[model samples]
Target chain A: MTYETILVERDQRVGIITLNRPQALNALNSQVMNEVTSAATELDDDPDIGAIIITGSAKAFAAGADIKEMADLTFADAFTADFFATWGKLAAVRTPTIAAVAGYALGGGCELAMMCDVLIAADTAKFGQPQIKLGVLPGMGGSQRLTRAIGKAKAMDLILTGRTMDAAEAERSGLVSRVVPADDLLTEARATATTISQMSASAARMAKEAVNRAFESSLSEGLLYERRLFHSAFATEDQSEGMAAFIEKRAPQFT
Target chain B: TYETILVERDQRVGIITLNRPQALNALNSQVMNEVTSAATELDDDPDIGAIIITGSAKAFAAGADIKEMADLTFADAFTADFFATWGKLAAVRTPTIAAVAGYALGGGCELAMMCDVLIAADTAKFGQPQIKLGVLPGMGGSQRLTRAIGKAKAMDLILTGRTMDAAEAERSGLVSRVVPADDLLTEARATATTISQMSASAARMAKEAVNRAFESSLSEGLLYERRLFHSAFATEDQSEGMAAFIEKRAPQF
Candidate 1:
């Protein structure tokens, strides 16, 4: 597919989307959001793709949203248009996403990174919700997801103070999965994405969805849901192949 | 006012100290009942602004009383709704802090997590340890622990019964902060005092809003947050807080 705001590529079974506005530090604007949404949706439906990676420049996974575009909007305008609401579609994509984040994932960028199933951060990565400086709060799921990942006290402190967290702190705070050397951010992310893609896609998808379900419901409900999904996996060819391979002491070739 | 626990007040902060040092303050039905009653009493008391639950410097309730469960059949556990009463801690409108000094394992760990915030000592050790007994976390451990930390780490902890140290606990979002063992109570009290001194209504709402994150979809939680945020505008404390900001003065509330 042709695109202007982002670059989309397929590395084996992994689909990669690199946010492509270096001039603005890949700041999210409507066009970028639209492009990412379309690209992700395309990747989600493609049987050849099993995992997706979304990334940006080494200087910034993204700096934030395009503030200049939102500087003049009143509450009525924002409420009416549901400004920046289109980004929600990206979260709805069924394919698992890994955010390969580097420096300065703030405001919407931080929210964007949190939307992924897993996150790999460059040691240079810095995260924050500096929107409060502009007399606004995080309009995206930052307020919710950040608080959910970390607990209330820390989330309240960061959100209210608009303070930046370094890569080490970000990993410790459960915001990102792991941190790699700055130069190896994309390399590590690709390695993980490739590994995930090579596994049983059906099982991978179910595992990701089950983990996502952890925060959305009570434990009893989540466990029951997980057991049903676990049962469903038995119906897949990959599961049979996987168990047989275990019995034969060999690596399974998944369908 | 209590026998199984020590209850004290420092200004607006109420501290409930678990006193069964012989048993490492191991929680049983009696401890649960006493702790709940004490906390609910303090929550109802107008003078108490915040509550801190803790144990001795040596241990913060090591684990549940295993003897109590040794004889219980599945039917006994189900009919009695074991550990269900601990939900009272979660129902407290005023904020509660767990000033954990030593082991917070099994139900003890879950008890600490029940509070709104947990302040741990550097020597503190946390774990489920239930999987070793051929059982599992029947408390909010599986749910709240997973909600605080992510699934991968929670899975490892639950499956392995490994202990997490203070540093890991703070980093993993299980505890708000960690302090030296000698300073655990002091730090917890100071934090509780600060929270207690804030506008009671705003504090309650802020806590409720944060809790809403785990209870609903993001969209629903956001809607709930915004409406609550809007409602805050109606409070005199909100007016004072915003006005104080503009005036370069501290909020009196």
Candidate 2:
């Protein structure tokens, strides 16, 4: 895998994407976002890859959009609605994504981290959307994702106050999947990838689909969706393994 | 002529109890139908605006009767339809409350979640372990569980058949609140009382908004909810509300 500003490597079924512009504390600018867009597009087009993991190269996943570049551009150009449309494409991928957070993941950085399916943060990681102070809302999925991750009340307080949450608090709020010591992030991410890789792709896809549908009908319709997906999973090869494993008392050897 | 439910009324609160003391009030065809009737009957009664469901002794109906479920055949598989109707019962016009004690598992957990608000005793245990049986939750179990909880917790529970006690349920936001066993009935009654005083129409519209609003993106849905909420203000009761407010007393509506 290749890109101008991001490093991409494949480990077994996991596509590891490293934010390579450490010099700017990996602050996402137009160039970095463009590179991220390319990297995800590349993985989406690949078959061997079961999932993708996005982690930081420098001291941060991304501090925010390249503040320097944004400082120079007009507000509309910097926070263009086009940016959100591009990010949405990455979020719609079938293969799940995992974000490995090490350092500061504030502002657009937090938004980028959340675009993934699972977010595993190091103890040292910090997340905030401080752009509110500058009279800017998180133009990316920050506000929406944060609101969805936590509840409306907490998300509102965090966005309105722009308070930073540590990795522990993030996990507690269901924002992050796991909070590990900074030293163990890679191994943990790989372990997570390995676990997901061994599951039935159809089941994972259906579960994801079901969950996305769950809140629909103001929640009731969403619950009914579970039955549809659950039935679909029954037709997949993985369903047998899932069932047999429970009956035979053996680990599922998913294909 | 014989069953696992207790029906009563006091001060307009329709108290429906699941009374299978031996079988833990395990829901069967009859129980489902009766409970549905109870909920529907309460919803229609002008005097009884709110209903509270309680367990017989310990268990808050330990879900569906597995002994009966295990015997289900292809034709019996249509029991899922009964659940679909049962789901409607859960979503009746009036507010519903589940005063759960002991274990509310399998379909039992879904029943608690079906109510608009859940009040559980500290000793209550809630779960949906249908996946362990090679079948998914046939009722609206997984959906309601997930909606009350979230994607991850619901996923883990249904996939692994994990159960949570009352404290865990409260902490995870599954139940609205929990109280000690001694206070369970009283606290639930108080909460039911608080809701009963509000205009019946107000509660109905509010539940409609909250339940239906989940269909959209949060902002859109919330705005939708707010729109409906404001529309409620245009009602005759709302005018009564203003007059009552000006009277320096609690608004009757």
Candidate 3:
């Protein structure tokens, strides 16, 4: 589907979502956030989309929220549950989201990128939480998400110092899976999505649920969470499609 | 970690054997300062890649000697500075390992938390029983415990001040690898040796990334990781090592 701020398209089974404003560095403004909401909802229903690919058009993935849109906000209450809250929604969707981080994935941009399950970055990319540089604290889960991704002390340094780190530094932190040349970013993302497409759809759904639980719950609780998701996925139409496909030695058209 | 915290070198590893066996290695201000200095010294040492500490036979540390806490108060600046240094040891590029063969109680547990890894002997015991003293385990023990085992266990450990056995500590994810008392020192040294085999420079960079990423955003984290990843490539050891791997011969670092 055509979009104004971010590009959303179906590339075979993988749906590609690009933050399309090169001039603005694709800062997540109201329109982009709104569009993403629709895209995520649409993908939730359609069986054609197996995975989602998110990237930016040029120098940035998304430089964070567009401050200009807020205009005159006296309180945090207005935006906390709506514009900022969509991240919670994006996080809940069944399909795994892959962030194809290119360059300058900083501030809210970094937070948005993190909502994805796997991250692949361009070699030149930089990431940080410079909200303090903007005279603000990272309100929207930057504090929570960062500590969850890296560790407490290192997260504290970056957030408190408001310093940007390079792509090489990013990979060591366990934030991204791998780093490739800038030119290879999209191709690598597409390849990763295609790889997952070959797997059992029911298994994929169960596995994502399992790992997401791992991130949230305690070890024992997380294992219990995995058990629940495992049994639930068997009821899906794709489960039978997957088994039949395996028996027939043919590709499963996951629904 | 004063003279009580004996800093001795074992080949490439810096071994700091806590020696307050009579008082269960309870850490005082002097001991903490010594530990702080020792961490900096090892970090600056050219030959050292890892640091490991173990208490003498009887106890890891009985938890800040109850006598030490009689006059001391947490209000002191030295208290914060002390814990800050301890935190640095855990977060530093030169990964620290704590070999626990006996009691790791109260402040003792805090001390071990400062290390990147904690190797418990089958006979070792651990706890955060500060509440028994009508106090809390200071110096990041409470926070670090929470991070290691999550909130529920953190509350359970500190609220009641109950000691966890070696097996419980292992299952709770507090210790890295548990070994028998006889093998405790050997296993810790071996782990340090494995670390030393890699380019110390690469190990440092990777350790820095791993340490910091435990806190930063994913994008920011990836950025940090990539920076370390490339910086590792700049080391002569990396190139020599990679080339050696490609060819039929083992190359020396």
Q: Highest DockQ: give the candidate number.
A: 2
How far residue B107's Cα lies from its native spot in candidate 1, in Å, is 20
Chain B only: TM-score of model 3 = 0.89
Report the lDDT tens digits of candidate 2 across residue range B128-158: 7655444566567656666665554565465
Q: TM-scores of the first chain across all predictions?
A: 0.97, 0.89, 0.89
lDDT of 1: 0.81
- Model 2, residue A72: distance off in Å is 5.3
Please tell me which predicted candidate would have the highest TM-score against the true structure.
2
Q: What is the interface RMSD of candidate 1, in Å?
A: 10.1
Cα deviation in Å at residue B59, candidate 2? 5.5
Q: Summarize candidate 1's per-residue lDDT along A1-255 as a digit string, tens digits.
A: 899889999978999999999999999987898899999999999999988999999999999888888999999999998987988888787767889999989999999998887788999999999888889998888898888777678889889999999988887877777789999998998987877677677766655666666777765576455545544554566756655564466777887
lDDT of each: 0.81, 0.74, 0.69
Q: TM-score rank, highest first?
A: 2, 1, 3
Question: fnat, candidate 3?
Answer: 0.00
Q: Rank the candidates by lDDT, best first.
A: 1, 2, 3
Stretches off by above 4 angstroms in model 1 are B1-145, B151-253
Clashes of 1: 0
Candidate 3: stretches off by over 4 Å = A76-83, A232-255, B1-253
